[PDB]
Symmetry: C3
Subunit: 461 residues, 3 copies
């Protein structure tokens, strides 16, 4: 079933190699695009496809965390002198071992004195004492990772085809890997070692995930990286993720719970007689009602194809680019001849909608029909075909044979509200063949839990 990719139309620059005090070469220069192919014959058709663009972020920090289910049970003591409900019993301490109660649960005590005598005597100033309880919700487990400045790699696919009696035959097929952060990188591509591929980047990739805190879910086991305010290992913000952390054993606890609990737990007596109180947690990312989970970066970020922790060693994360800038190629050899070939660009029809998504992304959700090669778009002013061009684009369909593909076209802010015409034309197609349609514009836009003790009072009068 062996078949070459669509050979793109690329201008070629003939450069001449410098010389030493010896025996007069030449280099063939061109700019290859990501997710496109280049074809040539040596005077067996040679093809190179810039398949993948990846960033390899080192993982500097790591820590497992979860989402806690919080429950607070209190008790009031009317007499400020009483032995029950005290600083030594409640202030900065975990409620001692119940022996039967769950191993997964994690509790912390807080001391609330200087109360108002409601359902009490006018002179005696009450005191409140609470057990803040935390257990994992739905057994949700995530790894938190600190991704720092990456190394960039390009992945090329070298294939050599032959036309033997009516059909194509993939003779040789390799994967070429080249580091893009330094100078030129050079290697032979064919088995015959006659030809050399030289890859050079202009500067940094058009895109790169920002150095920061990331995470993904764990299935008792890595998954698609997400981004939501998360705490660096050394930080403990209660409004950001990771204050409920998993230790070695698999036991979850509130990071410096003992000490911090009194700054994040706030309770006031409603009536000491009925044993009623107002309670809250001055935090986020807890259950109930304080936790929603952000979708993977892949989903929300069009430039991202995938963003995942590479393996079980948890040392690097790989960001696979969906959109990237071209790379500079030079093909060199002794002294022979090189000719570059290119298939034609075609298009039957297209469909799509202009959308501003919930994450503020302005794109044209384009779908091409029976298409191949380089396809040129022109976004128009009004609904009228022939109105003024406001943006001009070029999409590249990688299929040798005309097929139906779906793609995302980033648009400038000039492509504002209201429906408008868009005109697609393949490469070197007469303006009679140019398909036009009126495209639609869509746009997506962007506490106290009062309880009566329940457990009853053991110390009434």
């Amino acid at each position: 079933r062996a078949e070459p990719p669509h050979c793109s139309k690329t201008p070629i620059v003939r450069a001449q190699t410098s010389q030493n005090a010896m025996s007069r070469g030449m280099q063939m220069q061109f700019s290859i695009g990501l997710h496109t192919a280049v074809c040539f014959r040596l005077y067996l058709l040679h093809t190179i496809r810039l398949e993948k663009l990846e960033h390899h972020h080192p993982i500097t920090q790591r820590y497992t965390f979860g989402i806690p289910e919080v429950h607070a049970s209190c008790i009031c003591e009317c007499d400020a002198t009483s032995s029950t409900c005290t600083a030594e019993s409640h202030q900065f301490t975990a409620c001692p071992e119940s022996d039967k109660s769950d191993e997964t649960s994690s509790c912390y005590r807080t001391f609330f004195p200087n109360q108002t005598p409601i359902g009490c005597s006018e002179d005696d100033i009450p005191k409140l004492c609470c057990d803040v309880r935390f257990k994992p919700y739905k057994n949700m487990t995530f790894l938190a990772v600190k991704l720092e400045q990456p190394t960039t790699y390009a992945t090329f696919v070298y294939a050599a085809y032959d036309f033997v009696n009516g059909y194509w035959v993939e003779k040789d097929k390799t994967k070429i890997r080249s580091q893009l952060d330094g100078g030129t990188q050079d290697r032979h591509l064919d088995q015959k070692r006659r030809i050399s591929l030289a890859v050079t980047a202009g500067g940094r990739a058009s895109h790169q995930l920002e150095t920061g805190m990331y995470f993904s879910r764990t299935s008792n086991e890595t998954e698609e990286l997400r981004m939501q305010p998360l705490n660096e290992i050394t930080d403990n913000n209660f409004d950001r993720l990771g204050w409920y952390r998993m230790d070695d054993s698999g036991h979850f606890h509130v990071n410096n719970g003992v000490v911090k609990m009194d700054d994040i737990h706030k309770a006031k007596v409603k009536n000491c007689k009925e044993q009623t109180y107002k309670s809250i947690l001055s935090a986020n990312h807890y259950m109930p009602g304080h936790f929603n989970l952000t979708r993977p970066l892949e989903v929300i970020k069009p430039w991202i194809q995938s963003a995942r922790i590479f393996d079980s060693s948890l040392r690097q994360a790989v960001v696979t680019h969906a959109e990237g800038t071209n790379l500079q190629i030079s093909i060199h050899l002794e002294s022979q001849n090189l000719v570059f070939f290119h298939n034609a660009s075609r298009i039957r029809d297209f469909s799509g909608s202009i959308i501003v998504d919930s994450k503020s992304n302005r794109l044209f959700n384009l779908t091409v029909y029976e298409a191949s090669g380089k396809i040129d778009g022109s976004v128009k002013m009004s609904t009228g075909f022939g109105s003024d061009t406001i943006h001009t684009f070029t999409a590249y369909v990688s299929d040798l044979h005309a097929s139906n593909r779906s793609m995302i076209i980033p648009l400038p802010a000039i492509v504002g509200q209201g429906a408008r015409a868009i005109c697609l034309r393949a490469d070197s197609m007469a303006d009679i063949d140019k398909i036009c349609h009126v495209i639609e514009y869509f746009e997506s836009p962007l506490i106290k839990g009062i309880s009566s003790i329940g457990d009853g009072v053991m110390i009434a009068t």
Copy 2:
């Protein structure tokens, strides 16, 4: 009044287009600079000017905020048992409705017990009770915006001029827009559709505003974006902007005021008899005496021409680059001929000063007189002309006709303290024409409010 821009001197690379199993083209390649023009004739003079470079950041978060005017009124109760000044009346509660008092005001209550008996009896431990009041200052309103990784666009200006009887005539004039983050983008430029402009970026722009929190003022209505420590929607740091937020109705409130007020308001009794107390707010960005407003990015950042929220929909912000890297151009056609033209570079005189600004920017505040084209500078070691060159620069004046322009020249750290010579020479000018001057070096460098209640005590003994 139709006139072409200064046609820059640019080397042109002749590349040959690849071929298919059909009918032997050619492509003209060159690197266009931002704020410069390129001229050519087809064998009507064709001109292309790289006019604008813009980043289009999606706005992920949004919230209106203000600056609060804070006022705290207190009262002391000598007897720790008293019904006046209590946890239920003061701890975690907004002072109930006054019915006459301002709608714009926002108040919060705090409870300060366990006091020292100053102007009281040696055994009874006092208690203090305060109403922290907040109202907008000068009706100042700002939108807070979260700018994330942008899409880059180039804006070109295509104009075709003709010389009809002594004067130039702008025949055709278009605006070309090309996305710079992906592969090559291609479109026709002339009405005749004979010529095609192909734009390719090397990698990311030399500059890009960092993903973070930004804001600008609102005039009851967007303005020039500023940068000052500001809170992300989900965060509530009191030392950073946006803790005083505007809801739907236009009412400003302290974000989670009720709960947090006791962590940020700190008061101690001075004398319970005279009703004197020491008061403070453990926050920033409040009035009086705790608020200065950072100038727009445009002002402080030389690389920024403008940074503004694009429109009323508040979905994207546009950063217009003042300084940027060159773009790769290729002009292609059937088979005809292309010749590139360039006007000469001139300079009468210059003036300027070497400055290190308050924001640590080392630049040469250059002013050119009766100048056009490419102008070459050479910064010298000492005040002596002919001393060793320490930096070499090239500025490009876009005016066809010699005019007076002012510009910013970024300098390395080697261009240290003390006055020195700088020598300017236009392109291809003999070293006799080279203007020299000794340039001057300038350098810019980088709580408790105690009150006696006033309202008097209603509860004396």
Copy 3:
């Protein structure tokens, strides 16, 4: 002892300069790599070496800070009414002047009432009073600096050599400086002013230190910049560096100590009779046992050669790149001839190990023996020579004469655990000369202080 650098093998593109209504030039185009040289003769051998790549970050914020040695002495008062240990004496106040005690010490008082009567009477509720003391540890002093978006400069070395009777003679030798963030920069290189060097960057450097907070040690005096969670001037997080700040005089104090001390100091009575208590600081970066110092960026970050505050004025920091992308060069002249030369690439042997360091860096710690020029590596699948290639690299040794050098080779994540073969071959060397070795894989991975007062109680009953 004058000697040229290894002249690299570089393809040269012949471009033709545009023309005006006057007298037909030409430009020689090539991509120079960082830490490599280019050689040519004009028809005295001319050499240009891209020596240095630097980022010049402006320093927007500055503040000296230290590391504090913390000591807390307390005292308990059993009777809640007592004149000793009070809100006025302890809450939000510095312990008044001792007159003899150290000038370097900085103390703060905290008030802990509503205690439990341990070693006391069942009805009287105690109170605790502490003096938190802070002094510099080991007289450690550091400057905190805010580095913002930099300006990029390239530093070239132009040298012209002559071969006079058996040996080379360095005739002319200059340092060329070119700004990389804008358009093309142009200057003459030779004393004869015949030749012009034109430098153009594709986009941003492959690497750039992130805008943020940095610091380095001071020797009573700048040093190698480090990175560790540090507070921006306006922020006061106790879990991050710089809360212990040095004022003008050289006196260190806790940033807003008075006010914050009660939020970060937490103490509970153990027994009021014996005068025993549990004490802690809810902070980081303090002594004892809460401070380790991060190594310089140079050490941890392979892409960084050096990162240092430039000088005594403390206005800019210079980041010297160890790894960077190529720059675009064009050499132009009247009308004459240019020929480019290149020495050969050689290699005797090599040694090294594949390492994943503590900071998650995957690299090949390569050491070359009797080597010069362009050296090509091929990382193999298994230990077997001849197994499948998984990565391909190219290193450039700058020595004209074959010497022994050590280098860092960034590797993709595909180069996983276990030993494997790596094959090095110089440029244009037959596959017989290719040295192979099996290389080893190494991998580095990533509270309450209870005291009895000691000072004794002055107020027993």
